[PDB]
Every structure is written in C-alpha cells, then in structure tokens.
Design a protein around this nucleic acid. Structure first.
Ligand code: FES
Ligand code: K
Ligand code: K
Ligand code: K
Ligand code: K
Ligand code: K
Ligand code: K
Ligand code: K
Ligand code: K
Ligand code: MG
Ligand code: MG
Ligand code: MG
Ligand code: MG
Ligand code: MG
Ligand code: MG
Ligand code: MG
Ligand code: MG
Ligand code: MG
Ligand code: MG
Ligand code: MG
Ligand code: MG
Ligand code: MG
Ligand code: MG
Ligand code: MG
Ligand code: MG
Ligand code: MG
Ligand code: MG
Ligand code: MG
Lengths: 65, 113, 72, 170, 50, 108
RNA sequence: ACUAUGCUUAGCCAUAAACCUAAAUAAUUAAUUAACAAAACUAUUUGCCAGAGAACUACUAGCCAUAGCUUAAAACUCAAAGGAC
RNA sequence: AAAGGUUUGGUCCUGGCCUUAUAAUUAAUUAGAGGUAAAAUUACACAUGCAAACCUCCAUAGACCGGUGUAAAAUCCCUUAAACAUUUACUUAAAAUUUAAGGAGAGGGUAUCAAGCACAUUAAAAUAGCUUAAGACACCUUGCCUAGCCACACCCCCACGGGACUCAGCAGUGAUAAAUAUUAAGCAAUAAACGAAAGUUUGACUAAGUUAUACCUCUUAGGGUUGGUAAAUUUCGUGCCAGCCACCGCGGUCAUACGAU
C-alpha cells in the first residue's frame, strides 16, 4: 500500500507469494462443501448443453444457406 | 450528449475487486446521519465500472463517471481517473512520489526523470 | 458468598445425568432416526437444485455423499 | 452523560451552525489528512469538528476521507463539469479551512435567502384546511362569521329540519 | 465569478507551495549539519570498535 | 456500549405481547361444563366456587364465580372476563354476574 | 487386598471455581468514600448483559465427539430472586 | 415522571412487578331534552328494492364517485425518458394525469433462516464470476406515505379458460361475534355524466331517522369507593367459614379489609 515497487522486488527476490485478503469469509462443513460441488456441476452441465445446442442450431442454418 | 439518469454522476471509491473482464468492482462510501445518535457513519455502496484498459488494481482510489446508457444490468459507470494508485501515490500538492507520509523524492530536488 | 446458586445447578445436572442413563437406549434410537431424516432432507435439497435448473438426471458421475452416517 | 468526546457535536443546533453550503457544481469532497504530525493539526480539527457540519448542509455531496496517504493534508473538490479544485490546508487552522472553502465554492447569503422564499410561495394565510397546512380549517373560526353549529346552535329558521316542516305545512 | 475564485485558489496554492519549499530548505541545512556530526561519532566509534 | 455498538444494533428488541386467557378480547361467551370447588393455595383457607366452561373460541378454561352464592349448572351460558384470582392458581378468568344465565347476587 | 487409571508412543476428546471471579491500551492522582473487595477515574475499540426459576433444558446446526461438546428458546410458575453490612 | 407501594429481624445496594395520568371498544348498574361529530364483529352466505345515463339516430359516459383492507416488506423520497384511453392552445406548446426504465439516502420481525445456487462480466463469444455477519437467501407478520396514497372487486395471485358462480354500492337478512343505524326523503345546494341549449340523471351528496361512543348547552342523580399505596366508616352479623384484593394482604370471637347497615 505504500511502496509498490519495493514490494514487487521483495516478493520476487524472497520468493514469497502474496495473496490478497478475501472480502468475505466462507464457512466450510461437509453439507456446504457437498452442495457447493453439485451446484457448480449442475451449472457446468447446463452451460455445456447450451453450447451443443448453439453448434447444432448454427450448423443447420449454415446448411440451409 | 444527454447525461445519465442515475444520481451518482460522479462517485469516488476504492477498487475492491478486479476479477471481471474489463470491469472493476468499486466500493464507495458516503456519510449518513444516525437520527438517534446524530452522528455520521459510513454507508458503503458497490459500483461496477467499465475499465477499458484493465488498468485498475485492488486497493486504488478511482473516479467513476456515469455512463449515458447503462452498459449492462450493473455496469452503469466508467473509469474516469485513478486518483491514487495503490502503493504508487503521487502527492497532488508537490507532485513528487510518496510512500505514506514521506517523500520518495524530495520536493527541493528537481530530478526531471 | 454462599454457593446456593451452584447447588441448584448441581442438582439439575445430577438429575439430568440420571435421566439420560435410564433412557440411554431410547435416545440412541431417536438419534439414528433423526440423522436418517437429516440425510433424506439433504438428498432432496440436492435433487431440487438440478431439477429446477432443468436437468432431468443428476450431473454425470455424481452420487450424493452420505455425510451423517458412521463414516468416521 | 452523553458519550464520546465533545458531545455537543451530536446536537442539531451544532450541526446547523455550519455555514458552508456548496454550489450545485460541487459533487464530491475528498479529505486527505494525516493522523500524526504538527502541520496537520488544523486538518485533524477540521475533520473532527467541521466535516459533520458540512455534510449536514450538503447531504447530496459525497465526503470521503483518506488517512496518512500523502505527506501533507489537502482538500480536493470534484465538480459536475469535470473540474477538480485542489486546496492545500497545511499550516491552516480548521476555521481558516472553512472560510477558504466557503469563499471559493460556497453559495452567497443572497442566493440562499431567495431559495427560501421560493419554497414557501404556495402557502397562503387565507387558505383554509387542515392544521398541518393551514391556519384555520373553517370560516366559522373567523370573527363575525356564523359560528360552527356544534359550538353554537344555529337559529331554527336556518335549519333544514325546520324548513322541511314548513314546506310540508304549506 | 467562478473563474475568478478558481484563479484565486491557484494563487493561494502557489503561495503556500513557496512557503513549503522555504521551510523544507531550512530543515535540509539543519539536518545536514546534524548528519555530519552523527557520522563523525560513527567514525570514532567504528574505529574504536575495529 | 460504544456509539458504534449502539448504531450497529439500534433500539432494544421488544418481546411480543403474548395474549392471555381472553385472547386480547374484552369478554368471551362460554357454556358451563362442570361446577366444582378449588382450594386456595396456603396461607388462605376457603372453598372457592369455580366452573369449567367451553369458550366461544373452542378452548376450555376454569372460571371463578364471584359473589356469595350462584345458581349455575351445566349447559348454562355465561359471559367471562379477565382478571386472575390471586389465591387460586391457574384461574385467569371470571364470570360476569348479571349476564345471560348467571344472575346478580341475591342481596341479604 | 486388588483393578480401570495416573507413565511411554500414535490419534481422538475440547471440558474446569480454565477465577487476579480484574478485556486490552494510553492518561491523570484533583479539580473522588453505597458496602465489601483490589483507592478513584477519563478516553479509545471490541465482546457481553437487560427480574427469578423453568434452563449447563427442548428443538436446530456443526463436530473423529454416539449416556458427548459448542450453539440455545418457549409455554408455565412466582413477586420476588440476588449482592453487601 | 416531581414519583409512589412491595424482598429483610434490620440497614444499604441492585432489580422486577404493581399503583397514580390519558384514550378507545365491550359489559354491569343508571339516565331527561336539545345541537354537533362518528357509526365499526366477520374478504362469512346473501331474500327483495334501488345505486348510470343522456340524446335528432352517430357518439360520449357507465374506467369516475362509492366500498373494503384482499394481497404484499410490501414503501418513502428523488432522477430520466416517453407517451396520455385527456384538456386548452397552435399547425405547433402550456398544463393536468399517467406509464416505463432506474437510484443519493431512508424503510417490520426471526441469525436456532448462514449461506444463496446462475443469482456475473466480456462481446473473436471467451473469462469464472455475482450476492452475503455493513445480514444475502429463506420464513413469518403487517395496508401506509395520511389535504391523501396503495392494493383488491365471488373464488382459482392473473382470468383465454375453469369453478364451489358475485351486496367488500345504499338499505336489509341469515349465520357467526363481547361487538346490533333507516329494507327512509330529495336531486333544492355542491360534485360528477350527458346535451349547443332550455334541461335530465345520480343510495355521490344534501336535509332527516337511529345509538350516552365523543364534544357542547341545560336539567334531573346516579355509579363506585371508604386497611396501606390513595380522598373517605358507625353498628351489627360471620368466625380461616361465607367471602375480599391492582400490589402488599384481610377472615379461627373487640374484622376501620368479608356481608348488611
Ligand atoms: S367546523 Fe366550521 S362550521 Fe363546523
Ligand atoms: K389468611
Ligand atoms: K480463583
Ligand atoms: K422499586
Ligand atoms: K385477487
Ligand atoms: K342537485
Ligand atoms: K364483631
Ligand atoms: K365492607
Ligand atoms: K358499606
Ligand atoms: Mg432443579
Ligand atoms: Mg494397574
Ligand atoms: Mg466453557
Ligand atoms: Mg489455573
Ligand atoms: Mg457442562
Ligand atoms: Mg445439552
Ligand atoms: Mg441439542
Ligand atoms: Mg354497549
Ligand atoms: Mg374513493
Ligand atoms: Mg392481510
Ligand atoms: Mg430451535
Ligand atoms: Mg380476481
Ligand atoms: Mg361477498
Ligand atoms: Mg359488485
Ligand atoms: Mg352492505
Ligand atoms: Mg358498537
Ligand atoms: Mg358541456
Ligand atoms: Mg367488594
Ligand atoms: Mg380495598
């Protein structure tokens, strides 16, 4: 926050990685970590289906043209 | 060249995040009077701002300009200026680099580098 | 400084400990069933998510973890 | 005992003593001050005593204060045109700071009085209505006018009950 | 009137900038003298320590 | 508490006013079910005249009958009011003398 | 008289009147005796408290804990409970 | 709050409860007359009558007024744009009234509701983000902003459709509730609708009827209380019984505390 140039050199030379403090604390327990894993997986599946649909829709339009 | 509808035509805040593409999450704070205590406290608001050049870093004070048309649901401002860069502040009064309450370059000197 | 307030708590805890000892076997069966209902509620809440999202089957290679059973 | 130091700052009379009413151009006032030092004592007193008074009279102006970021304290105003007015408040008393900003970016007494009169243009003393908006609810209250029948009974000949009886009698 | 007041403000900032350089100049002279004396003590102590 | 703590919490939370035997109503009408005697908790000694009633709400409560002598019987209708009988624990209702089947005390 | 156990090595458990029954920090000792204890008192920040019992309880959630710990009510009863002398 | 009563053998501290003030609804007992204001159990089911017309045909109005508090944390305040199912002007502008997208700040309860689970950005379509202990999300409760505003209009949030098929317009009824206004008169005044107009219409409204719920002026007198807090008891009866108290308490034979006087 004061001397960024010295900060960059110090971290590079000393080999220290600096991670910024996260804005919000995340609670962790078996029920949360298991629901959060499904929620991420469900989203990914929904988005994968949309991408496939777009490719098929575009492919059909290209053939018509 | 009509201006925005939003009340915050000009807002100052701190860049609390920069993980979205070309967008910087900025936390502005205003003073609100507690009616019971008659004392002012800090009410903070989050503003998404269009950072076209991705020139923003977490912790730097910035000035946002209200966009004439909202770019998206939440992006209704753009990055006008970076008032203070994080760790790279330049004293407005003298114009010399500073690192806290100290001069990295003396104001007596004229480096012109 | 008397210990009278400590003696009231002393008797409550003594009597409560003897009540738990009498009905220890009953309490065990209540818990195993409360955990089973706790697991079903967890599974149903996970099924609600993917069904609302529009999926007709749970994500591929997903099996709801059994988190309340005697896994440890 | 009211808590805190200088509890008078938390009274409506003190907050109303502020005299700096910014022009419509002023939108933001950033305050850069140092918590330790000798040349920034007036700036620290300005944040302690004056910033509450300024905010009270300028509720729509964003006052954001930054601490120990620069060697010297200063004030920077952001205007709606895009202009930035930098003020240097080092070695300046808190009272001097208030007077400086009042001159450069403060509305004049003439302007403020004109706005006050315009606000009350639609209140008329003659208007009748509820107490919240008017002096008198009814003309019965006025002296010389016929009084309210509730307070003073009307003459029999001025009553519909009596007139109806005569019309039947006729 | 706005332009005149914004010109007066810039004049006040320059006037105070001049005082700041005058004050800091005096400090450099005094602090330089102290620095030379402090370096002398280090030279004396450093030689003795060696 | 500090001024910051008073601000973050605000005014004291106020527990809701739970209702009593009349359920926030001036009176209720009930049908007598049984007439019995209740004994006042010591140090008092008496045979206090009470009755069970089914209130219009549908619940059943115990009501003290004031006065020297009542003619109440089962299936009668009465108008109950609030007010606890201090010696009788749990008796939070009273019968109104002079309404419906219950009548004014016979003066001696 | 003799076990579990107190010991070692691995892991769990997470509770004490874990109490100086004194949160931390920086001031002041006079323009200051509720009592007793440990003289009084200001400022700053966070935590906590809001009659007693029901209650180190019921339910909820987390936990290697399964006769467990932490979190923690209400109905109802009472006109007191409690501290010091 | 100008406070008071009540922990003890006693004092002090702490602390709850209650008392004294004010107002509304209902009930007991009791009351003459007049003027005024307000009328109120119930989004329960509704018998009958009425509540919208006007007018040379076209149109306009029946979108208002009046009613209820259904739903909803629902909102307040403010900004922008746009029309208007309009009015009054011009061939181009002043209003009234709305709608849409928003946000300086403010805005009920429960944190034993602590995570929500797509809630983000970019614009080669990639990046993996968004909200949240400064309270998200979930649930519960509630009309609020009061010259008035908002939502609802038999029910299914909606109303193509379907259904258990309409007084939450005036008066009135059934049921239910501690809760009890006339199945009334007139469009003369004001307001609205229509008409170029004389005019017509209106359970809006006006003038009445009803009711100690309130106020006002008069006339009669009733109601409660009488141990302390807290203004005020004579005699007898009763004898821990019968009874009484907001709190403390009273009653076992001289009861200022019960009942009658
Ligand atoms: S209020 Fe004026 S006549 Fe009654
Ligand atoms: K007694
Ligand atoms: K100890
Ligand atoms: K007290
Ligand atoms: K509806
Ligand atoms: K008329
Ligand atoms: K006697
Ligand atoms: K008596
Ligand atoms: K008497
Ligand atoms: Mg016990
Ligand atoms: Mg052994
Ligand atoms: Mg502990
Ligand atoms: Mg120890
Ligand atoms: Mg324990
Ligand atoms: Mg437990
Ligand atoms: Mg438990
Ligand atoms: Mg009545
Ligand atoms: Mg209306
Ligand atoms: Mg409702
Ligand atoms: Mg619970
Ligand atoms: Mg409907
Ligand atoms: Mg109906
Ligand atoms: Mg209808
Ligand atoms: Mg009706
Ligand atoms: Mg009534
Ligand atoms: Mg006309
Ligand atoms: Mg009596
Ligand atoms: Mg008495």
């Amino acid at each position: 926050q004061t001397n960024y140039d010295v900060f960059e050199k110090t971290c590079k030379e000393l080999g220290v990685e600096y991670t910024l403090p996260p804005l919000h604390f995340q609670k962790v327990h078996r029920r949360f970590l298991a629901k959060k894993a499904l929620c991420i997986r469900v989203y990914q599946e929904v988005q994968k289906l949309k991408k496939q649909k777009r490719a098929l829709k575009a492919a059909a339009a290209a053939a018509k043209k | 060249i009509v201006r925005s509808s939003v009340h915050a035509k000009w807002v100052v805040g701190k860049v609390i995040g920069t993980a979205m593409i070309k967008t910087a999450k900025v936390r502005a704070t205003r003073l609100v009077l507690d009616p019971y205590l008659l004392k002012y406290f800090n009410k903070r608001k989050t503003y998404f701002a269009h950072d076209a050049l991705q020139q923003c870093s977490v912790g730097d004070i910035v000035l946002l300009r209200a966009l004439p048309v909202p770019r998206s649901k939440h992006v209704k401002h753009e990055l006008a200026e970076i008032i203070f860069k994080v760790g790279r502040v330049i004293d407005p009064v003298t114009g010399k680099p500073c690192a806290g309450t100290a001069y990295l370059e003396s104001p007596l000197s004229e480096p012109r580098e | 400084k008397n210990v009278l307030k400590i003696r009231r708590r002393k008797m409550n805890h003594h009597k409560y400990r003897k009540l738990v000892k009498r009905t220890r076997f009953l309490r065990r069966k209540v818990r195993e069933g409360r955990l089973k209902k706790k697991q079903i509620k967890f599974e149903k809440d996970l099924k609600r998510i993917w069904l609302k999202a529009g999926l007709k089957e749970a994500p591929e290679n997903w099996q709801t973890p059994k988190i309340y059973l005697k896994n440890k | 005992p009211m808590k805190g130091r200088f509890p008078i700052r938390r009274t409506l009379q003190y907050l109303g003593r502020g005299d700096v009413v910014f022009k419509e151009s002023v939108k933001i006032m950033t305050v850069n001050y140092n918590t330790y030092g000798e040349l920034g004592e007036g700036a620290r007193k300005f944040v302690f005593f004056n910033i509450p008074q300024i905010q009270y009279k300028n509720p729509w102006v964003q006052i954001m204060m930054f601490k120990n970021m620069t060697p010297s304290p200063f004030l920077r105003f952001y205007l709606d045109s895009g202009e930035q007015v930098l003020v240097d408040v080092e070695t300046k008393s808190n009272k001097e700071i208030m007077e400086h900003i009042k001159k450069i970016l403060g509305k004049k007494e003439e302007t403020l009085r004109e706005e006050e009169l315009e606000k009350q243009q639609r209140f008329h003393p003659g208007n009748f209505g509820p107490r919240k908006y008017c002096l008198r609810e009814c003309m019965c209250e006025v002296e010389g006018q016929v009084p309210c029948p509730g307070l003073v009974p009307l003459p029999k000949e001025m009553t519909g009950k009596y007139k109806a009886a005569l019309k039947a009698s006729t | 009137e706005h332009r005149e007041l914004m010109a007066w403000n810039r004049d006040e900032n320059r006037r105070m900038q001049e005082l700041r350089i005058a004050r800091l100049q005096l400090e450099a002279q005094a602090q330089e003298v102290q620095k030379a004396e402090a370096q002398a003590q280090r030279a004396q102590e450093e030689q003795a320590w060696v | 508490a500090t001024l910051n703590q008073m601000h973050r919490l605000g005014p004291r939370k106020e527990p809701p006013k739970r209702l009593g035997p009349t359920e926030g109503r001036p009176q209720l009408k009930g049908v007598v079910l049984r007439t019995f005697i209740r004994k006042p908790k010591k140090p008092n000694s008496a045979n206090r005249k009470c009755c069970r009633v089914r209130l219009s709400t549908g619940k059943e409560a115990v009501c003290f009958i004031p006065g020297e002598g009542h003619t109440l019987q089962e299936h009668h209708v009465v108008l109950v009011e609030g007010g606890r009988t201090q010696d009788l624990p749990g008796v939070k209702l009273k019968v109104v003398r002079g309404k419906y089947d219950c009548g004014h005390v016979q003066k001696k």
